[PDB]
Amino acid sequence: MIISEKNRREISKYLFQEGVCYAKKDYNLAKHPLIDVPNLQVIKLMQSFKSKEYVRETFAWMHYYWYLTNDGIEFLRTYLNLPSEIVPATL
């Protein structure tokens, strides 16, 4: 899916800073409740991350639940150019 660079940066930043993220299955929602990006782009970016094992996806009662993995943490650290010391708030 075509995603603006700023939107992808914001999504990745939020995911790494928090380590978890949810999303209601609403493709046409204007903005994600926690992220300024539209809901569809957040859902599809998380699906892309899950497809290559960067995140774990759980679905229940029309909602998504994404949890970052070690490979996902490494990818986000490399891509965001953050120092190795900084880690997701969950740890």
Is residue 62 part of the contact set for other proteins (CB under 8 A)?
yes
DSSP letter for each residue of 28-43: T-SS-SSSSS-HHHHH
Q: 85 touches which of other proteins, RNA, none (CB within 5 to 8 A by kind)?
A: none
- Which listed range, 13-21, 29-37, 59-67, 71-79, lies at the site for RNA (CB under 7 A)? 59-67
The CA dihedral of 42, 46, 4, 81, to the nearest 10 degrees, is 120
What amino acid is encoded at 78 in this protein? T
Q: 71 touches which of other proteins, RNA, none (CB within 5 to 8 A by kind)?
A: none
Q: 4 touches which of RNA, other proteins, none (CB within 5 to 8 A by kind)?
A: RNA
